[PDB]
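Researcher: Let's walk through a ligand-bound prediction step by step. First, I give you the protein sequence. Second, the SMILES string for magnesium ion. Third, you return the three-dimensional complex as structure tokens. Ready?
Model: Ready.
Researcher: Here are steps one and two:
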Amino acid sequence: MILDTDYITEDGKPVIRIFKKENGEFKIEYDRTFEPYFYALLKDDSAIEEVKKITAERHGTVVTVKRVEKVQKKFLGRPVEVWKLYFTHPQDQPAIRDKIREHPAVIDIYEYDTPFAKRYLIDKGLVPMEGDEELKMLAFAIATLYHEGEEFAEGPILMISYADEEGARVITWKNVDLPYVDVVSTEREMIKRFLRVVKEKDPDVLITYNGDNFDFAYLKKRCEKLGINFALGRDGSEPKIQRMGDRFAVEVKGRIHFDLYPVIRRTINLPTYTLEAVYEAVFGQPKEKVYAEEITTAWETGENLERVARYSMEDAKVTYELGKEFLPMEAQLSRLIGQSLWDVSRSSTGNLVEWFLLRKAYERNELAPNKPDEKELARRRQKYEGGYVKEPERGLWENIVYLDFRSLYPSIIITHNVSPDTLNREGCGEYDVAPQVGHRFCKDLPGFIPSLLGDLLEERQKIKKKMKATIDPIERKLLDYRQRLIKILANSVYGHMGFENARWYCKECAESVTAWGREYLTMTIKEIEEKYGFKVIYSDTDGFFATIPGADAETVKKKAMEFLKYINAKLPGALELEYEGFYKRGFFVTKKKYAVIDEEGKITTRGLEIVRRDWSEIAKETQARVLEALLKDGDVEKAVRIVKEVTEKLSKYEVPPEKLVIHKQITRDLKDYKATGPHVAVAKRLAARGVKIRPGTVISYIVLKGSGRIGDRAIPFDEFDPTKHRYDAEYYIEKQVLPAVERILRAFGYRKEDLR
DNA sequence: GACCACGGCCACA
DNA sequence: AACTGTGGCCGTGGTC
Ligand SMILES: Nc1nc2c(ncn2[C@H]2C[C@H](O)[C@@H](COP(=O)(O)NP(=O)(O)OP(=O)(O)O)O2)c(=O)[nH]1
Ligand SMILES: [Mg+2]
Ligand SMILES: [Mg+2]
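Model: Step three, the predicted complex:
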């Protein structure tokens, strides 16, 4: 099973290393035969005689075109003659590419910026994370001495905890009487002992929580301050820090550094992404949090240290369990994209799509288009229409059926051969013309994107089929995650065509797809209304809710089945309407905001404040109980009493402030914020206090009784002292709970004043 | 002060 | 955060 790949430089030549695990043994395959290259397009063949002659310089050394080779590839679906230019070292390409492009005899160059090891993975047709081989994992966490105001990593590391299949252990340089703590003399000895533990256990995976942006950099600063070689890598190297956009990432050669934080943030949506909250969400059992002030006082005074040891041990244990749960799942992403687990765990969706498309293009000998330059990026700053959405018939309805298409946009792409290589293709005999926008697509030869999307949807349907017969529930989870991957990947492949910095960009294709979707959905609505007597309550982009005004549930279901058979006979290609749920009742507030109740009593809420993180828990809970009173038995009076009781509880300062916290995320650097909201104000005060604040952190604040501007009277919830603090009950009454319940209870004649 | 455009956040498909 | 478009909704400023 291929773990990863890189390359070293041996006597000026590239040597690919393939790190793998075969028969329970870690092996390193070496390859000195892979030659770096990129493609060039000339207007005349004989011009190559001069193309071989352009040289450049790297670090005093001269860089020359090693060898050239004429090759036939497929650009925009059409055969074309390109020149493969080979080089000695990959680092030659960034230094000579421009000099090649400046030449008048060349039109353009292609596939010049792809990294060497990943190009080796693609060209050799290798897929990592493949096989039944089980890896050994080791999770670890650290405890730090934090005073507010210091710089990063000034204080030493107090405890280093690790965990695996054998249990959890803490290492510390102060005496704690516990069966899982190992006491050493100094911090240096503790770090060295952790290194010895890693070297002896030799895990294939090192599991951390946000180790990409804290634990590893902290250990690096301390290791250099005390003169320790942080030789965690299986080849004796130390963690390599790399850029990951605005954040950082940490590699450990020969191993896989699995940082859970981006995986969890990208997989599950939570109000906060603390280790305690993530663990309680994934496993249901709570985890006690010990804050930095407690451990700082416990270290400086030497008391209550067993509590900090417990916190560190539990940290290591829960990160190990989360790694065990999430790693086999991300291995499926690694197999799907064809890149290393380390890469796919941290890479954005767009880069995942680009790697998948690059691998597919290599498989079909399709010359990959280049990323746009600045002027071309400027041209692509266009605007096209999106999906159709109607103003909902606001209010409460009964006996509702939701009908929606199966993978609307990919099915459109497949059915009409929507692809950049098929758009306005001269000379074909069968065309498909998009509504409104009028773009034509040839259907003689299947397009690149339609082919990939068809394979993907076929695989997803096979996975959903096997899920029904799946016995082993761990496998059920596996195939569920895999089909979710395929779904996200297909939707992102559609979105790729309308992305400015995308290689296979095609605004015409994307707007054609969305016009098709609008046409098909409005057609289905018109047909279900005019010919089956339905009334469409609400309709988003790929489906709608409908009902027979005044009819039995069975009648609505039967007529919906009829309409499905009819409209699916009328629908072409891969386009199919599906019955995806009957609901006893449903309250629709506005576009993207509704709630439905089915037959067994399960409430599905969409868009409402109950599902939003930036709303207070008291408001969410009040709206939830109100919606339950509405949807379970239609007890409007019960809901009005709920809101009156909750507002009286708020007025008398009787509600716990924990239910009063608003969580909002900062998305940019505080310098670049033009409008400063309450969370912005709290973040700016925190940064003024010398607290690390970066794009990604979540500010959790409470509004206090005070002077106007909410941001002036809002403080982080950790600084809330009930003795000297009183939350603004009027704020959370008149502007959190009441507005949340009013948009619902107005449909029964209640104004805000009938609720306080 | 009443009112209103609008960064800014998160959600839905 | 780092494929897209559509939408609701708030806290705040600034101009009448
Ligand atoms: N660029 C982009 N477009 C999207 C996304 N989600 C939806 N679209 C658009 C394009 C999609 O064609 C359309 C439908 O989205 P689904 O509700 O996901 N339909 P499906 O049948 O795949 O879900 P299921 O199989 O679970 O029932 O929404 C997204 O995340 N990104
Ligand atoms: Mg569907
Ligand atoms: Mg849907």
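Researcher: And what stands out?
Model: Residues 305-337 of chain A form the longest helix (33 residues). Chain A has 21 helices and 28 strands.
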